[PDB]
Design a protein around this ligand. Structure first.
Ligand code: 5PQ
Lengths: 14, 182
């Protein structure tokens, strides 16, 4: 299972 | 390696758009927009579509796992409940756009621990008399699963302990009282 944090998902907006 | 690859998601997610039309059925008014299985393709699709607040009243965004359609009729959506968030008139400004985006990240990031396999999807209802955001599960009989999803769901959105969010099965919704509330 692949888990992504909220902090990490926000940084991929660019 | 790790320089050119897209960060892949656990599940493939399909985004749906619903627009009410009295001339046709409910299922025909729900239409699909795209599918994605990476973090990059999620932001690519989301950054060009409208915010939930800007939508015309009577329209729904629906993100679900690939294979589950946004309707009680689906196998996984049968039986399974709904963690319902009612929003008032003024909440349209900032709370609606922020709660729905926070809901999307809880789905695709699978932050619900082991109980992310029970999570079917989410839906936001842009309505003129209220706004509604919801998370759908695959079974309401799993109290161990349902309570843990809604409790993390409330902590991630950051609601005060004063507001209690309701969970209701689609068998009651299609015919209301809550089964579990946090
Ligand atoms: C998600 N959903 C809401 N409805 C109907 O919409 C009517 C009013 N509009 C809505 C609700 O109620 C919702 O939730 C929603 O959206 C209700 O009486 C529901 O019976 C539905 N009817 C079919 N056949 N299939 C659905 O998936 C469905």
């Amino acid at each position: 299972r692949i888990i992504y944090d909220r902090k990490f998902l926000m940084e991929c907006r660019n | 390696p790790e320089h050119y690859i897209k960060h892949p998601l656990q599940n493939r997610w399909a985004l749906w758009f619903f627009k009410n039309d009295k001339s046709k059925t409910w299922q025909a008014n729900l239409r699909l927009i795209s599918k994605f299985d990476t973090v990059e393709d999620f932001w690519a699709l989301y950054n060009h579509i409208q915010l939930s607040s800007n939508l015309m009243p009577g329209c729904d965004y629906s993100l679900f796992k690939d294979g589950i359609e946004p309707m009680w009729e689906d196998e996984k959506n049968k039986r399974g409940g709904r963690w319902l968030i009612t929003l008032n008139k003024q909440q349209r400004r900032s709370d609606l756009d922020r709660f729905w985006l926070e809901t999307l990240l809880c789905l695709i990031g699978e932050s619900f621990d082991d109980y992310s396999d029970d999570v079917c999807g989410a839906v936001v209802n842009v309505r003129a008399k209220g706004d509604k955001i919801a998370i759908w599960t695959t079974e309401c009989e799993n109290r161990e699963a349902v309570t843990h999803i809604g409790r993390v769901y409330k902590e991630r959105l950051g609601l005060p302990p004063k507001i209690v969010i309701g969970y209701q099965s689609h068998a009651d919704t299609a015919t209301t009282k809550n089964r579990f509330v946090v």
